[PDB]
Amino acid sequence: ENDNYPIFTEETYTFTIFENCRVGTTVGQVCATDKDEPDTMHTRLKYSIIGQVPPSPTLFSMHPTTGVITTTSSQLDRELIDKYQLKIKVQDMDGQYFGLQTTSTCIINIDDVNDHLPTFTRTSYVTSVEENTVDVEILRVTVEDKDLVNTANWRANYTILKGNENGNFKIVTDAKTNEGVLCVVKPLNYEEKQQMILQIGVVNEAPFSRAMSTATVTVNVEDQDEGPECNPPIQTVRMKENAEVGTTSNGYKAYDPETRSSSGIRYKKLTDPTGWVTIDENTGSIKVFRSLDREAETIKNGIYNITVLASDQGGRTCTGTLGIILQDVNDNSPFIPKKTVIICKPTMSSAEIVAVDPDEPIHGPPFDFSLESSTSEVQRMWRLKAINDTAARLSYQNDPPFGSYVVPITVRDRLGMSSVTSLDVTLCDCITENDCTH
Amino acid sequence: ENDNYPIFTEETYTFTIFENCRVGTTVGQVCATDKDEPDTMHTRLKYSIIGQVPPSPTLFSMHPTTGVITTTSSQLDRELIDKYQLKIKVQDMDGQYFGLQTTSTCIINIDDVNDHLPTFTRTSYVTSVEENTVDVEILRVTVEDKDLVNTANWRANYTILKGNENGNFKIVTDAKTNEGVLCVVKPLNYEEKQQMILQIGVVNEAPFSREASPRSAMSTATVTVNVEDQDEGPECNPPIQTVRMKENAEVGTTSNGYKAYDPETRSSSGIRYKKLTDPTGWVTIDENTGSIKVFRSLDREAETIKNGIYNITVLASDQGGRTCTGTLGIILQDVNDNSPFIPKKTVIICKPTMSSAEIVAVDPDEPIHGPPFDFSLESSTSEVQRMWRLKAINDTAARLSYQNDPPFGSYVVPITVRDRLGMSSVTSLDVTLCDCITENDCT
Ligand SMILES: *[C@@H]1O[C@H](CO)[C@@H](O[C@@H]2O[C@H](CO)[C@@H](O[C@@H]3O[C@H](CO)[C@@H](O)[C@H](O[C@H]4O[C@H](CO)[C@@H](O)[C@H](O)[C@@H]4O)[C@@H]3O)[C@H](O)[C@H]2NC(C)=O)[C@H](O)[C@H]1NC(C)=O
Ligand SMILES: *[C@@H]1O[C@H](CO)[C@@H](O[C@@H]2O[C@H](CO)[C@@H](O[C@@H]3O[C@H](CO)[C@@H](O)[C@H](O[C@H]4O[C@H](CO)[C@@H](O)[C@H](O)[C@@H]4O)[C@@H]3O)[C@H](O)[C@H]2NC(C)=O)[C@H](O)[C@H]1NC(C)=O
Ligand SMILES: *[C@@H]1O[C@H](CO)[C@@H](O[C@@H]2O[C@H](CO)[C@@H](O[C@@H]3O[C@H](CO)[C@@H](O)[C@H](O[C@H]4O[C@H](CO)[C@@H](O)[C@H](O)[C@@H]4O)[C@@H]3O)[C@H](O)[C@H]2NC(C)=O)[C@H](O)[C@H]1NC(C)=O
Ligand SMILES: *[C@@H]1O[C@H](CO)[C@@H](O)[C@H](O)[C@H]1NC(C)=O
Ligand SMILES: *[C@@H]1O[C@H](CO)[C@@H](O)[C@H](O)[C@H]1NC(C)=O
Ligand SMILES: *[C@@H]1O[C@H](CO)[C@@H](O)[C@H](O)[C@H]1NC(C)=O
Ligand SMILES: *[C@H]1O[C@H](CO)[C@@H](O)[C@H](O)[C@@H]1O
Ligand SMILES: *[C@H]1O[C@H](CO)[C@@H](O)[C@H](O)[C@@H]1O
Ligand SMILES: *[C@H]1O[C@H](CO)[C@@H](O)[C@H](O)[C@@H]1O
Ligand SMILES: *[C@H]1O[C@H](CO)[C@@H](O)[C@H](O)[C@@H]1O
Ligand SMILES: *[C@H]1O[C@H](CO)[C@@H](O)[C@H](O)[C@@H]1O
Ligand SMILES: *[C@H]1O[C@H](CO)[C@@H](O)[C@H](O)[C@@H]1O
Ligand SMILES: *[C@H]1O[C@H](CO)[C@@H](O)[C@H](O)[C@@H]1O
Ligand SMILES: *[C@H]1O[C@H](CO)[C@@H](O)[C@H](O)[C@@H]1O
Ligand SMILES: [Ca+2]
Ligand SMILES: [Ca+2]
Ligand SMILES: [Ca+2]
Ligand SMILES: [Ca+2]
Ligand SMILES: [Ca+2]
Ligand SMILES: [Ca+2]
Ligand SMILES: [Ca+2]
Ligand SMILES: [Ca+2]
Ligand SMILES: [Ca+2]
């Protein structure tokens, strides 16, 4: 005789399921303990649903033996009905009408899924930002989403779909308010582009379930009155090295980006390693003060560089480099770098002598070597003939003896600029040229 | 049983209204034709609005019968929302649910009115201009105006309210960019005024929205213009300077000449002078000091001089090579060193129609050193003094009469005239007492 009731484990169960879920979705399982004798009618339990709130339609089904609740429809919608309440019944004696019974409450809440795409509150946006500004928000767009707040199905994830080729802008999302903020991350240039059109899009963090919203934003760049710019950063001018003192020339030129004019700009010299020219403060033109020299040792590549400081009346500054190309003038004769030559009597018959002209090639080789300025006594026992455009060979004539001589070699360039250089020639008894102690 | 849908005349209407318009403003009218039996329920049409974008608030209401759209609020703002799109529906059978229906779109654009006053983006401006410069822009001010670009509700219309009394400055508005441009149109002088403060103002071409009650809430801005100093050359102020010098000065006596100064320094150092014009050549200029030195004796009564003032023009120059010209007026203070004189040496008196001639004397010196003159026949023989009388008719006009009976012919009468202080002069006159009639026939 079962003189005992079967009681549900929980007075009020609570389960959770997702909306739009497949039918047959296991919601949860109830169980009941029976103090009576195991494994006989007296403890064989049966489970059922007795009430549902809201009542219709029927959306939940109980299994008679196991006590498992399941959905019967996909018509679960969090945005319409978030919670259902059930009263359940367990009856012993295999569920026969004369079986003992208990009741219990059973809560079912519907959790959210991302089935609403987020949408911009406006179709188009417009903002205006100053040029040469960076790391600032210039616009805030706000979005609509019908899903559950403060969840991955709700909060937005913005992107710039088109228009951000140069990477000037960045869009990010505020966690505090879920609106998107458009930020400038590279400065803009009104003289390059006065207006920039972008297209933004928005999705949630969570992927869509079961056509993304878009909006165009035109950003108008504002012109600010800027100072002088030294473009190009490197300018060059030509000037004859034999230019007369007082002769002027265009110097560095800087212009205003707005006006595109050079007026009002005052110049000033920074670096100058030679100090041949001066700058007119008002015009920026340069005037020769001391004679130029393309072949000077302070010069390299025959180019003479000074740095200049441009400034407008507003007080903003700009620095450039003026390269003064010194046009060559044939004002240097060739010369022989190595003044001492060693000739071996039993293994050599001549030496190689090379010359150099500081001027540019047009005003240098081919060189003509001669012994014109020489005594009658060396010109009988010394020959030279050019082996190429810059070098010649000095051979010994008429059986000369061992000893240190002195040979005056005259070298002249293509245009007749002449130079004589006395060489200390030694005709010792060398063999490898590295053993000549004479 | 009518079996016809009502189709809108236009698939997508388009209307326009002004922002801030009264409620009940007619926006436009939609219509639909029903290709069906006329004048029974089977064709009596009903119109409605089914959607509005943006949705809230409801801003337009349709008339069920006429199809006229009207505004329901004055809260239409072009600067917030410029365009609305709504979907409309027309249904036959008098709008009963079993009535046939079609839909159509209706775009509504908001037109602009001037309800934002333009305002300077800065409250105060400062600029710097070079002196003795003109016809150049010295400042560009920009304004904020939220109204519709390139319209009379937007573009600015500038004025200099105060500070521009001498008319040095001019403001105009740039057509391309709507910023105001401040131009200098009369040159400035750093030595008079180093700084000039003015106040500018701005309005639109169009007046502020009609029912406005702000009086003048017009935007204004102060502009400080700092004049820049130029290193200028010598100034000949006054352009005419004057100096006094005794007419009887000894040769070699010096005196201050023309004086020019630097506008910045107010000093005369470094300035070298040079003579330009001098019609007489009595004085010379010291190139370094500008002082003048007498080279030949002066003469107030010389004919190259007029009004007893002896003028040379001078060229002042500073060490830089820039110039300045002035006029030095040398006052020759008179010294009584001249006796009276006879203007005309031959008088023709008619014996049968006149009894005397008029003889006037002239003293080159100043009035104080001249009349009244005393005429006399002192140096004359006893022989003319019997047949010639003279008495002054006034202080300088005098008369020569014949009292005895002389014969017709040319004589010589020496009239000695002396001045107020006794400088005397004797002058022989060829007086002819021929038998003339009108003074014009005596040979
Ligand atoms: C004023 O400015 C001008 C222009 O910049 C400058 O003229 C240049 O000088 C450089 C040397 O500093 C030259 O560059 C060389 O070119 C040759 C051939 O192209 C190369 O063989 C060189 O290579 C060596 O040096 C390099 C230096 O960067 C190294 O990187 C490299 O590893 C090698 O060691 C070098 O590139 C250049 O040709 C000239 N330009 C002209 C037009 O002649 C001039 O020197 C400046 N004035 C002064 C007084 O400095
Ligand atoms: C006209 O004739 C003269 C006389 O022959 C000639 O002068 C010679 O030019 C050569 C260049 O080919 C010079 O050779 C150099 O010698 C030194 C040591 O002596 C070396 O360090 C040099 O560089 C070496 O480095 C290279 C990089 O690895 C090696 O691969 C290479 O083998 C080089 O050897 C170079 O050898 C020679 O010294 C001069 N002679 C004299 C006396 O100065 C000149 O070139 C001719 N002119 C023309 C236009 O042909
Ligand atoms: C050297 O410079 C000085 C001044 O720098 C100059 O002295 C002036 O010369 C002018 C010559 O035109 C004189 O002008 C005359 O002044 C007398 C006295 O007041 C007047 O009666 C004269 O009247 C005539 O001209 C008038 C002109 O408007 C007519 O309206 C009138 O009807 C008469 O025709 C005439 O104005 C002047 O008086 C002097 N003195 C001054 C200005 O103090 C001097 O003449 C220069 N040297 C030489 C050689 O001229
Ligand atoms: C936002 O979307 C981009 C691609 O659309 C993705 O790479 C990124 O991880 C997303 N951010 C978050 C926080 O989910
Ligand atoms: C400029 O201002 C004046 C005075 O305020 C006004 O009458 C005029 O209409 C404005 N616009 C033009 C184009 O002149
Ligand atoms: C003095 O005499 C002359 C003679 O012509 C006359 O012109 C002048 O008016 C007279 N009166 C005077 C100077 O008061
Ligand atoms: C079982 O429990 C409640 C009381 O807790 C009863 O009122 C009801 O019959 C339920 O089914
Ligand atoms: C759950 O709650 C209901 C009331 O809402 C009770 O009647 C039931 O017995 C269980 O305690
Ligand atoms: C103008 O700009 C340069 C930097 O390029 C500075 O060196 C100068 O002081 C002024 O700021
Ligand atoms: C002149 O000076 C600036 C620094 O003041 C440099 O950065 C520039 O490149 C120019 O050489
Ligand atoms: C009118 O009505 C229907 C419902 O909005 C639309 O599908 C149709 O394209 C037109 O807009
Ligand atoms: C007018 O509006 C839209 C176009 O923007 C249409 O899709 C709609 O059906 C109505 O005809
Ligand atoms: C003096 O002379 C200079 C020229 O040397 C002029 O420029 C100036 O106007 C004044 O006449
Ligand atoms: C010297 O020259 C000036 C012009 O610079 C004249 O104004 C002046 O009258 C004098 O002749
Ligand atoms: Ca039991
Ligand atoms: Ca849903
Ligand atoms: Ca959802
Ligand atoms: Ca969502
Ligand atoms: Ca720029
Ligand atoms: Ca700019
Ligand atoms: Ca500008
Ligand atoms: Ca500028
Ligand atoms: Ca040289």
Ligand SMILES: [Ca+2]
């Ligand atoms: Ca050279």
Ligand SMILES: [Ca+2]
């Ligand atoms: Ca040469």
Ligand SMILES: [Ca+2]
């Ligand atoms: Ca019909």
Ligand SMILES: [Ca+2]
């Ligand atoms: Ca407005």
Ligand SMILES: [Ca+2]
């Ligand atoms: Ca306005």
Ligand SMILES: [Ca+2]
């Ligand atoms: Ca407006």
Ligand SMILES: [Ca+2]
């Ligand atoms: Ca001045």
Ligand SMILES: [Ca+2]
């Ligand atoms: Ca000055």
Ligand SMILES: [Ca+2]
């Ligand atoms: Ca000066």
Ligand SMILES: [Ca+2]
């Ligand atoms: Ca005199």
Ligand SMILES: [Ca+2]
């Ligand atoms: Ca006198």
Ligand SMILES: [Ca+2]
């Ligand atoms: Ca006198």
